[PDB]
Amino acid sequence: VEPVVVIDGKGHLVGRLASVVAKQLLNGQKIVVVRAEELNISGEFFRNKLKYHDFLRKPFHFRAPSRIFYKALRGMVSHKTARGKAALERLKVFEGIPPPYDKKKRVVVPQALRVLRLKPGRKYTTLGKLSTSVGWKYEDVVAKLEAKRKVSSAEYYAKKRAFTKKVASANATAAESDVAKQLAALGY
């Protein structure tokens, strides 16, 4: 339905998000993933640092959270095939929200959120912490310039809220009229 979909990785499970993205873009849907560093994995820090060195001690290994997510997505797609290679060309993963994706709406997957999937009172791991612990050196800059992203975007939202205030006032003053009642009668 959407020519390009931007998915906010924060608060989502790596496995569920990877599976849903693989299924979606295997059907030709273009998907973009942002804020991968904020992606979460179930379980406390231990047993999440583990199971990574286990396969590491075997090739080339990538420490960036985006590369980890791609590897998770890569194994869920029939790579080495033209369809698999073509499907993987419709995927983009970045840390934070670099432009121009910062100026566009970002969606989430209800069936992949940690809150809706993980039972309360259970420890969970975050991709950023694991990446830093396994040698990632860009967490500091990622956080620093993500905080700046919220800066002045709060101001943009405030301006939008102010504009919508005037829009609502204009609607209300024109409301209750004959045309307004006619529209409300037809569910609009």
Partner: protein
């Protein structure tokens, strides 16, 4: 194998917000080795005040001039060169570095950029303001004045030096003022300062740290090779010149040990990348006598003034 005749600085020391804008590294050409004797003033040593004898390398360090400044944005995928800016002029040997067939080529070096600098500066000032507001890590672009060093190379080696000062606005202001200026060797290093050396061996590149500068050579004054004790009117250059090297007629640096690379090879110096706390670094290297005997062959004399003393007189 090394990437080129020159080596690349892989790291720089941590920036200092309070210190003024200053350079962090210098480069020069190997000028062989020489013998020196000094009083071992190291405390708690069985050879305290003894005349320890050891070898010290000599590196020719011609004046280095600033030719540009470069800022880098701290992107999530490493540092990216935001914008490079040269300053109104490129030297003949600087231009030569950009040509493999300089003699055959039309020598069409910076022409519109030089003409661009002749404008009201708005573009250059716009880029300076950009750097001021934008990326707060800056590296200076410099070259070696090989036209002064007596070498057949005749080609200037371009190099980048990172500024260690704070208030990158001050950095760009210093660059705006010190453009196309000449920086003396003594302005970057001083005696007793610990530095590291990086070069290319006779062909891999390697780095050695914790090397003390025994003497900083101001090649403008005579008797640069004489210590406070010897204080003779002798230059570090022995009789007849140097082995496979032309002559020393400019600023030079003397470093403990032997920097990698044969004679005439270009080397770079850096301030150890950190504040070493060892007492060896802190102690000052008082100098007693520096060998100046002809290295070519077996010299029985130091300078021609005393050479005739052994023979008395000659035909």
């Amino acid at each position: 194998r090394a990437a080129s005749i020159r080596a690349r600085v892989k790291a720089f020391p941590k920036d200092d917000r309070s210190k003024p804008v200053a350079l962090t590294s210098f480069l020069g050409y190997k000028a062989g080795m020489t013998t020196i004797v000094r009083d071992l003033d190291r405390p708690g040593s069985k050879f305290h005040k003894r005349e320890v004898v050891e070898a010290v390398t000599v590196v020719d360090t011609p004046p280095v001039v600033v030719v540009g400044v470069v800022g880098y944005v701290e992107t999530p995928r490493g540092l990216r060169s935001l914008t490079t800016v040269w300053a109104e002029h490129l030297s003949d040997e600087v231009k030569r570095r950009f040509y493999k067939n300089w003699y055959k080529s039309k020598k069409k070096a910076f022409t519109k950029y030089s003409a661009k600098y002749a404008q009201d500066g708005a573009g250059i000032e716009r880029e300076l303001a950009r750097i001021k507001k934008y990326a707060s890590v800056v590296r200076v672009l410099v070259h070696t004045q090989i036209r002064k060093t007596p070498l057949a190379q005749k080609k200037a080696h371009l190099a980048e030096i990172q500024l260690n000062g704070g208030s990158i606005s001050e950095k760009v202001d210093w660059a705006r003022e010190h453009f196309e200026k000449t920086v003396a060797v003594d302005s970057v290093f001083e005696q007793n300062e610990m530095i590291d050396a990086i070069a290319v061996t006779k062909y891999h590149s390697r780095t050695s740290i914790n090397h003390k500068i025994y003497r900083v050579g101001k090649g403008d004054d005579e008797a640069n090779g004489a210590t406070s004790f010897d204080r003779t009117k002798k230059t570090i250059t022995p009789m007849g010149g140097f082995v496979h090297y032309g002559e020393i007629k400019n600023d030079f640096i003397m470093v403990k040990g032997c920097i990698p690379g044969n004679r005439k090879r270009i080397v770079t110096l850096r301030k150890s990348l950190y504040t070493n706390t060892s007492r060896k670094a802190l102690e000052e290297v008082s100098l007693k006598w520096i060998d100046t005997a002809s290295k070519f062959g077996k010299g029985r004399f130091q300078t021609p003034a005393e050479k005739h003393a052994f023979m008395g007189t000659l035909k």
